[PDB]
Write a protein that binds this ligand. Structure first.
Ligand SMILES: CCCCCCCCCCCCCCCCCC(=O)OC[C@H](COP(=O)([O-])OCC(O)COP(=O)([O-])OC[C@@H](COC(=O)CCCCCCCCCCCCCCCCC)OC(=O)CCCCCCCCCCCCCCCCC)OC(=O)CCCCCCCCCCCCCCCCC
Ligand SMILES: CCCCCCCCCCCCCCCCCC(=O)OC[C@H](COP(=O)([O-])OCC(O)COP(=O)([O-])OC[C@@H](COC(=O)CCCCCCCCCCCCCCCCC)OC(=O)CCCCCCCCCCCCCCCCC)OC(=O)CCCCCCCCCCCCCCCCC
Ligand SMILES: CCCCCCCCCCCCCCCCCC(=O)OC[C@H](COP(=O)([O-])OCC(O)COP(=O)([O-])OC[C@@H](COC(=O)CCCCCCCCCCCCCCCCC)OC(=O)CCCCCCCCCCCCCCCCC)OC(=O)CCCCCCCCCCCCCCCCC
Ligand SMILES: CCCCCCCCCCCCCCCCCC(=O)OC[C@H](COP(=O)([O-])OCC(O)COP(=O)([O-])OC[C@@H](COC(=O)CCCCCCCCCCCCCCCCC)OC(=O)CCCCCCCCCCCCCCCCC)OC(=O)CCCCCCCCCCCCCCCCC
Ligand SMILES: CCCCCCCCCCCCCCCCCC(=O)OC[C@H](COP(=O)([O-])OCC[N+](C)(C)C)OC(=O)CCCCCCCCCCCCCCCCC
Ligand code: HEM
Ligand code: HEM
Ligand code: HEM
Ligand code: HEM
Ligand SMILES: [Mg+2]
Lengths: 360, 73, 205, 44, 33, 49, 32, 96, 192, 77, 180, 18, 35
């Protein structure tokens, strides 16, 4: 396999005008590696038994040498997984990368859904108040689908049997993801990568050493920022209620999931209908997938350069980004008629921008 | 001595390329000049259309042997 | 390749033989060798000296073209719309282009005072060139601009100090820092594997 | 309901990157727990 | 087109479009009409 | 969390070391960036040496 | 205003000058 | 990779496995060129970055102004107007 | 014979198209309806003056300044991964192909440095359509091939000869035909 | 003399030349800006264009899109 | 990967005089598959906590639908893994297969050691008397090697921490075997 | 093994046909 | 596989990937046979 290693990581030729916007695929991969290493290590001392799960995490931190380091690194790195993915996806929408890298885009979307499901499974394991009540709610939005809920839990409620099986699934899915990363890379190197200017060019150079040293430089920043946040606690990435034991007969005063799920949780909150809110979920994913066939939606021949430079009409991806930020604020607020009004305003922009990306 | 490259790319002059590489050497009167003469002979030379009676694949010269056996052709 | 073309009929994007989008004025040479004379007798804009953005040449193309709801970009050239059985006949007197289906399925190439074999020899794509070709299209002499620096400004020449010792002390320092980071992470993993603080105390009695 | 008010920022020594806990004050707070709070609260 | 084996993506395109036309038509009849 | 002091003292040693290595890797990257950023390519004929 | 304006953008004259400065055959760190 | 009419090779030696991706993207140098490169051990490699700093910074910041900053200021303003109407709506319903 | 009845319906609709097909060029009918072409003309003097007009003019200024900063033409922005444009590039004469090669090299270098060209190197019109004659001939060649050879969904032997069997001709371009050999030194399809 | 970026073509036997538009008058509001052409003389677009509106476009664009949405949202949502 | 599938499982040519002595490599592979399927299924309801491990296995059999089938299939198939391997190795020694199939023999020996270790880890999990006392003894024969014992257990005796880590290793090693 | 799988794309080839 | 002096092929058509193992064990039928 060493001829494959040198063909794809040493002698592979790349355009000279690459920059840091093309380095975040490597960073995501490295976050998976770090999670697998720290995750397996945590598994040696975790207990899936509901009556003792919450206690096994605390005892791990308070009694075991270096136990605090593996617990806090696993929690912090999870946040960096989703930040890197977000920047990774936004580059593609800025450069219309899916125009000719079609199966790379689709394979990526599957990886995104796999990572969402993995993170949701992991957040239930510590078995605090937010673990229990967040799983109860998010698993009810899927109630319109018949009998899709009572079986995944194996009971009449998020009981102790659900926790045992969420542990096994959480263990397994990341390694399946590693298989799909191989397909992702297959579809990319089939066509070759694009560049920031959106042109064909013969001014290319080998990956090693020029481009390999840019990936290495970015890795340093990632490791330093993870350890900075992990060891000092500068930002508030976790909710305090998950430091409280589960109580099935007392709901917390404010239920909100992790930040990387907040925006779409707000969209589903401002739509009163429960069935209409789930249809909105499918339409959004369908729109992202349809971009793989953007060449065929109009007979005019497209170009990769979108001309956002010095342009006062901006671009649709930029307008989406600010609508997402606006909704993260709404999702973190107490329900109030005024918040609901503006939340619906932003939801329209959040959805319309996706649809018009298929037009040109 | 400047370490640098000067290359003329031309795809309209046949399938054969020509190249030369150089190191900084020593002057006539150097106490090490005789050894440079010898090092030149250890690397040696080779022509595909004039090997002689010793096939290149079984030459004693290691450089010739490695070049002639590359990709079995 | 894994990419298909999208040549199909379309009711909103009419065929180029009817709506060209690009500026539809072209000159026509009897033999393409004549373009070499045009390239030595016409003047080029890039040979004049201008100093302000306001003095730059104005394009002959119009900005008003593509229209529609949520259509962000407003100027295009080419499309893959299918051509019909009987396309529109180009008007050569107005400078219109004749190429492809508009040569094969029209009588645009007939000339009463010439044999057909001679007339149609002038309708290959190399025989047509858009107005403004010789005055505008650049042909660079280098990738580098004389207004920008290159290695002549930055090269270390005679009298310079050797850099090898510094280059390898840079790389060695990175590695003895990265080696220490790895050794510490492994030692912490081994500690975690060993007995905990609650069990070490129970053994003492 | 409404959002509760944000509490003020008191200058606790430990809030700095370079600082440790203030052990003399930790000792006195353990007397307060043992003689007042422990009558109703557990620390299991 | 003739000469390549990209044969599933054209099917995915027609299913996705159809699905979108049905979602936004089922919502209008419930809110507007 | 009685492990707060151990956590913070280890972080100072680590974040400072990593930062220094980040500077060194920046220099090593720009070392290779300059050979292609200062490169000259001429079409037709040779201009300058 | 030239900055950010597609109708006027160009470098001011003090930036074109900085690109013309030359320090050929100088090395202040050579003693190191 | 490259188009078929560019991938065609002039030589006949076989493609080695470590070079499969190189030759999948072969491109003909139409017209030719002359290349000059200096060894990195004989170049100043940090000064060039700062020598061109002002020009590079102008180009980048000018490109991003309209498309990113102008929508950001509008979003920031909407965030303030929203928070000003929430407070007034709480007092028109609960305060006496 | 249920297949022969369906074939009769297809045939009736087919013969109707032919009997109503003209034998010379006829302009296409207007797309938009009369109700839509009346509102537009009534609101045109106000919509065009203050919105659509300046939108068109800003667009062309944004495009022209970006291209000129890099020394590029508009037609340089099209990719050789389009089958039509790839065929057009094969038909070019040497002089036009050489100038495009050079402009693309120079533009990648300028985008890498992020340094503008001087104003006196930007004095040219970037919107000259130098590819048009070759694009229209390419479209004609590929429309013939599709109508004469690609009018039916043909069957084939599956996973044989390096291809999947569903239409691909160049080998090893889909995952289920990846990794052609376990031993040996492999080879190139261009050296068969 | 001629409109746009064209110059008088030289007379070379064998090259048929397309007709070229002559230069047209200018309007107020383009001083100091990179030139972009106006619609042709015989055209409805020329009767309605005014280069002075380019300066106000950054605001007009925000109002036609976000304006209706804000008023519709403040009335029914 | 379909050209590899047809090259090695369809068009691969074999001598006509093969018989059942050459079929036990396939059978071993199929036993691994069955163990992975039944093992993962058992993991959905097993508890590594020493104080409740023994009870979780019994409750699995006595209360859960079809729980007896997955428990008894996993235990029986383990015995057939070792019987097939034994017949597989004996054929090689009868025919001197290692004469020219050298790296096939060595790679096989690594697979055998991996399977031994996996089975030993699995037998401790149900946490009965033989689980505890068999691990205590077999882990003392390795006492001559210094400090090779107190760390694998993470304690002064086969305690509750050893059981948690034997579960993770037992989960992982079979998939490494599939690589080899 | 460390030189197994020479190519990811293409149709491969035989060393006896070089 | 077979020895080198047996693997040598008489034809020139390329070996297809599904047949790589077949031709790694080519053997000449010395003397011929009828089946
Ligand atoms: C000394 C005293 C103290 C002071 C000193 C300082 C002290 C502190 C310590 C020292 C600090 C400095 C040390 C030296 C640093 C040297 C290195 C350096 O300069 O680095 C810059 C350098 C820039 O890269 P480059 O190659 O030079 O140029 C790339 C081009 O810019 C790419 O451009 P392109 O044209 O090639 O590509 C097009 C497009 C392609 O797209 C992309 O590349 C991807 C998308 C880019 C945009 C990102 C935003 C979208 C994502 C949103 C995320 C939302 C989060 C959700 C949570 C919200 C919570 C509320 O990208 C863009 O458009 C990029 C431009 C974006 C401009 C954004 C403008 C914002 C305007 C804001 C207006 C606000 C208005 C309201 C104001 C109100 C108040 C008045 O980046 C690096 O080297 C990266 C190193 C680190 C790797 C990442 C690891 C950490 C991951 C987390 C952070 C993620 C963001 C990281 C940046 C990403 C950039 C793409
Ligand atoms: C290798 C060298 C290195 C060393 C050795 C390495 C050794 C390891 C390598 C592996 C060795 C073992 C062999 C593994 C073989 C694996 C199979 C394989 O290779 O197949 C490739 C094969 C492609 O073969 P090919 O030869 O490249 O080309 C085939 C044709 O000849 C030509 O076709 P084409 O080119 O025209 O188009 C092909 C296109 C065709 O594209 C499609 O047909 C679309 C496929 C993706 C659809 C979903 C994406 C999102 C779309 C929007 C949302 C839609 C929602 C549904 C509603 C739709 C409207 C009704 O396919 C792709 O784009 C590829 C995508 C990659 C899929 C891989 C997934 C494998 C199965 C595992 C799935 C696990 C999912 C976990 C995450 C979710 C957990 C909840 O892929 C397939 O065709 C299978 C597609 C399977 C799709 C599964 C989608 C599951 C998720 C659906 C969405 C559910 C959302 C629910 C949300 C609920 C919220 C509460
Ligand atoms: C805020 C945080 C970020 C960092 C600080 C801010 C960033 C700038 C810091 C200053 C560094 C640059 C100094 C000037 C350039 C030096 C190189 C050079 O060519 O200069 C001469 C050159 C002209 O000379 P020439 O005669 O033409 O050519 C001579 C050479 O042969 C030309 O040959 P060459 O071009 O091939 O290169 C020569 C080579 C040779 O250079 C040498 O002379 C060799 C020096 C060997 C040592 C290398 C440095 C290692 C330091 C590591 C830390 C200490 C470790 C020891 C233990 C510490 C224990 C506490 O240069 C180097 O290798 C440069 C070494 C210095 C690297 C930068 C180190 C900064 C951080 C230091 C502390 C560590 C980080 C904190 C963590 C620790 C504490 C918690 O002039 C310039 O390049 C123009 C100078 C103007 C540029 C400076 C602009 C500064 C203001 C902008 C930044 C403002 C703040 C950030 C704003 C953005 C965020 C809001
Ligand atoms: C009793 C109360 C009833 C209330 C309900 C409403 C009742 C309204 C009755 C009105 C009756 C009188 C007016 C009738 C007009 C009829 C027009 C017509 O049918 O077309 C004729 C005619 C059709 O002929 P045509 O041949 O099709 O021509 C089409 C054009 O070619 C088009 O193409 P073009 O190339 O010429 O144009 C360029 C094109 C392309 O331009 C571009 O792409 C450029 C874009 C640049 C954008 C740059 C933005 C940068 C700044 C970003 C700022 C940050 C944002 C992000 C941050 C967010 C943070 C959260 O521009 C556009 O696409 C324009 C976009 C307009 C968007 C407006 C959408 C408003 C929606 C309001 C909500 C509706 C409900 C939603 C759902 C609710 C839940 C169920 O069209 C025209 O001649 C043009 C007329 C255009 C008029 C547009 C504005 C109409 C406004 C009406 C009043 C609305 C009031 C609402 C509030 C009321 C409160 C009480
Ligand atoms: C068996 C491997 C080691 C494991 C045990 C040791 C602990 C491991 C932790 C690191 C220890 C330090 C490394 C050893 C020193 C190496 C020195 C050496 O010989 O190098 C030769 C040289 C030394 O530097 P040099 O090139 O200047 O030396 C030239 C030769 N001299 C000086 C002798 C004339 O290094 C290289 O060739 C560098 C190659 C490029 C690699 C760049 C490194 C950055 C990494 C970026 C990618 C991210 C990696 C993470 C992947 C994760 C995947 C899941
Ligand atoms: C992309 C990969 C992964 C992601 C995104 C992820 C995410 C998470 C998250 C968010 C938590 C909750 C942290 C908390 O709030 O306490 C968690 C916990 C956990 N994860 Fe992971 N994980 C990944 C991989 C793995 C793997 C591969 C394993 C084991 C093989 C693992 C084992 C565990 C365990 C045992 C816990 C419980 C301990 C705890 O909650 O701190 N994880 N994971
Ligand atoms: C585990 C998750 C992912 C990993 C490990 C990963 C990895 C990579 C890597 C290493 C690259 C090449 C380097 C780079 O461009 O950054 C890349 C490119 C790419 N990725 Fe990802 N990716 C992931 C998720 C995604 C997602 C979610 C998408 C889109 C929805 C996506 C779409 C793309 C595209 C289109 C490219 C090519 C960009 C271009 O060349 O223009 N990937 N990916
Ligand atoms: C998980 C364990 C194993 C699996 C799945 C496996 C699989 C196979 C298979 C499918 C074959 C070809 C068919 C056959 O001859 O039965 C084979 C052949 C062979 N195996 Fe195993 N094997 C395993 C363990 C071993 C062990 C423990 C040894 C020896 C210590 C070994 C040595 C061999 C040899 C020498 C052959 C070639 C026999 C011949 O052609 O004469 N294998 N193996
Ligand atoms: C070659 C593969 C395997 C072998 C030889 C093996 C062997 C064994 C043995 C001997 C036991 C003890 C049975 C008893 O006496 O009760 C056991 C138990 C167990 N194994 Fe496996 N195992 C294999 C694969 C797996 C895998 C892949 C998993 C999970 C991913 C797994 C999960 C379990 C569990 C949870 C138990 C405890 C339940 C019980 O003891 O009945 N096994 N295994
Ligand atoms: Mg199209």
């Amino acid at each position: 396999f060493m001829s494959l290693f040198r063909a794809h990581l040493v002698f592979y030729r790349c355009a000279l005008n690459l920059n840091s916007s093309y380095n975040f695929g490597f960073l995501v991969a490295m976050t998976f590696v770090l999670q697998i290493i720290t995750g397996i290590t945590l598994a040696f001392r975790y207990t899936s038994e509901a009556s003792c799960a919450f206690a096994s995490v605390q005892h791990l931190v308070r009694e075991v040498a270096a136990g605090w380091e593996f617990r806090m690194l696993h929690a912090t790195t999870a946040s960096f997984v989703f930040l890197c993915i977000l920047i990774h996806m936004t580059r593609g929408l800025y450069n219309w990368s899916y125009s000719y890298l079609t199966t790379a885009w689709m394979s990526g979307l599957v990886l995104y859904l796999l990572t969402i499901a993995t993170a949701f499974l992991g957040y239930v394991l510590p078995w605090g108040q937010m673990s229990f009540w967040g799983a109860t709610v998010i698993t009810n939005l899927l109630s319109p689908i018949p009998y899709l809920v009572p079986w995944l839990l194996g009971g009449y409620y998020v009981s102790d049997v659900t926790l045992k099986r969420f542990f096994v699934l959480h263990f397994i899915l990341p390694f399946i993801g590693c298989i799909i990363i191989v397909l992702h890379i297959f579809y990319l190197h089939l066509n070759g990568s694009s560049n920031p200017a959106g042109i064909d060019t013969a001014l290319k150079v080998a990956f090693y050493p020029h481009m390999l040293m840019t990936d290495a430089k970015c890795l340093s920043y990632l490791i330093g920022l993870i350890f900075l946040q992990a060891a000092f606690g500068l930002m508030e990435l976790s909710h305090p209620d998950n430091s409280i034991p589960v109580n099935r007969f007392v709901t917390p005063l404010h239920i909100v999931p992790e930040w990387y799920f907040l925006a779409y949780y707000a969209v589903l909150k401002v739509i009163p209908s429960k069935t209409g809110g789930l249809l909105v979920f499918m339409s959004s994913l369908i729109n992202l997938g349809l971009l793989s066939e953007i060449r065929a939606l109009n007979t005019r021949m497209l170009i990769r350069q979108q001309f956002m430079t010095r342009n006062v009409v901006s671009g649709w991806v930029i307008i989406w980004v600010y609508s997402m930020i606006f909704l993260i604020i709404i999702g973190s607020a107490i329900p109030q008629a005024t918040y609901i009004l503006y939340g619906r305003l932003a939801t329209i922009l959040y959805l319309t921008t996706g649809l018009v990306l298929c037009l040109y | 001595f400047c370490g640098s490259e000067l290359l003329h790319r031309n795809d309209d002059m046949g399938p054969t390329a020509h190249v030369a590489v150089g190191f900084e050497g020593v002057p006539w009167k150097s106490p090490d000049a005789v050894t440079f003469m010898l090092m030149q002979a250890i690397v040696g030379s080779y022509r595909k259309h004039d090997e002689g009676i010793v096939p290149g694949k079984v030459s004693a010269n290691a450089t010739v042997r490695n070049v002639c056996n590359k990709m079995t052709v | 390749s894994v990419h298909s073309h999208n040549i199909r009929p379309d009711k909103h994007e009419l065929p180029a033989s009817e709506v060209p989008l690009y500026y539809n004025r072209f000159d026509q040479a009897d033999h393409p060798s004549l373009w070499q004379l045009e390239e030595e007798q016409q003047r080029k804009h890039l040979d004049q000296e201008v100093t302000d953005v306001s003095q730059l040449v104005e394009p002959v193309s119009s900005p008003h073209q593509t229209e529609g709801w949520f259509k962000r970009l407003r100027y295009w050239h080419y499309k893959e719309t299918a051509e019909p059985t009987f396309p529109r006949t180009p008007d050569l007197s107005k400078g219109e282009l004749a190429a492809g289906a508009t040569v094969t399925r029209t009588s645009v190439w007939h000339d009463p005072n010439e044999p057909a074999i001679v007339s149609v020899s002038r309708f290959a794509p190399d025989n047509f060139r858009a107005v403004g070709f010789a005055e505008n299209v650049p042909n660079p002499e280098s990738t580098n601009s004389d207004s920008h620096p290159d290695f002549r400004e930055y090269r270390l020449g005679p009298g310079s100090v050797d850099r090898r010792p510094f280059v390898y002390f840079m790389s060695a320092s990175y590695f003895f820092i990265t080696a220490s980071m790895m050794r510490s992470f492994l030692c912490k993993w081994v500690h975690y594997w060993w007995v905990s603080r609650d069990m070490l105390a129970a053994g003492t009695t | 309901e409404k959002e509760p008010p944000h509490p003020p920022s008191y200058p606790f020594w430990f809030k700095s990157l370079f600082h440790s806990h203030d052990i003399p004050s930790v000792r006195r707070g353990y007397e307060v727990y043992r003689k007042v709070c422990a009558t109703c609260h557990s620390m299991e | 087109s003739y000469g390549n084996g990209t044969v599933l993506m054209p099917i995915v395109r027609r299913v996705f479009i159809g699905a979108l036309v049905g979602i936004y038509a089922y919502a209008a009849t419930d809110v507007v009409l | 969390e009685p492990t707060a002091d151990e956590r913070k003292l280890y972080g100072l040693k680590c974040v400072s070391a990593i930062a220094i290595g980040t500077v060194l890797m920046t220099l090593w990257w720009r070392f290779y960036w300059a050979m292609y950023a200062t490169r000259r390519i001429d079409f037709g004929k040779l201009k300058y040496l | 205003i030239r900055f950010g304006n597609p109708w006027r953008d160009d470098y001011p004259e003090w930036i074109w000058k900085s690109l013309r400065v030359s320090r050929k055959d100088k090395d202040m760190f050579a003693p190191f | 990779g490259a188009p078929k009419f560019e991938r065609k090779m002039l030589g006949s030696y076989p493609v080695s496995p470590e070079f499969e991706m190189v030759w999948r993207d072969r491109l003909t140098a139409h017209g030719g060129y002359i290349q000059q490169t200096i060894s990195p051990y004989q170049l100043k490699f940090i000064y060039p970055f700062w020598h061109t700093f002002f020009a590079r910074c102008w180009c980048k910041c000018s490109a991003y102004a309209w498309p990113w900053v102008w929508p950001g200021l509008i979003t920031f303003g909407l965030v303030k107007k929203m928070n000003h109407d929430v407070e007034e709506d709480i007092r028109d319903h609960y305060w006496y | 014979q249920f297949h022969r009845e369906i074939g009769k319906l297809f045939a009736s609709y087919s013969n109707k198209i032919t009997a109503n097909s003209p034998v010379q060029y006829v302009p296409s009918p207007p797309t938009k309806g009369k109700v839509r072409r009346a509102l537009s003309s009534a609101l045109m003097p106000v919509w065009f003056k203050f919105f659509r007009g300046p939108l068109d003019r800003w667009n062309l200024a944004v495009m022209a300044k970006y291209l000129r900063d890099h020394g590029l033409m508009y037609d340089d922005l099209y990719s050789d991964k389009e089958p039509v444009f790839a065929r057009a590039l094969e038909l070019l004469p040497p002089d036009i192909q050489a100038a495009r090669f050079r402009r693309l090299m120079r533009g990648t270098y300028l985008n890498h440095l992020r340094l503008y060209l001087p104003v006196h190197e930007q004095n040219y019109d970037p919107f000259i359509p130098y590819m048009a004659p070759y694009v229209e001939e390419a479209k004609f060649q590929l429309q013939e091939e599709e109508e004469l050879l690609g009018y039916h969904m043909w069957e084939g032997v599956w996973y044989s000869g390096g291809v999947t069997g569903f239409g691909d001709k160049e080998p090893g371009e889909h995952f289920l035909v990846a990794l052609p050999n376990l031993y040996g030194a492999g080879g190139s399809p261009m050296q068969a | 003399k001629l409109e746009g970026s064209l110059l008088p073509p030289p007379h070379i036997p064998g090259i048929r030349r397309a007709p070229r538009e002559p230069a047209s008058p200018k309007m107020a509001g383009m001083e100091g800006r990179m030139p972009v052409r106006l619609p042709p003389e015989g055209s409805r677009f020329r009767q309605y264009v005014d280069p002075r509106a380019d300066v106000y476009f950054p605001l007009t664009a925000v109002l036609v899109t976000l304006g209706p949405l804000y008023m519709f949202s403040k009335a029914f949502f």
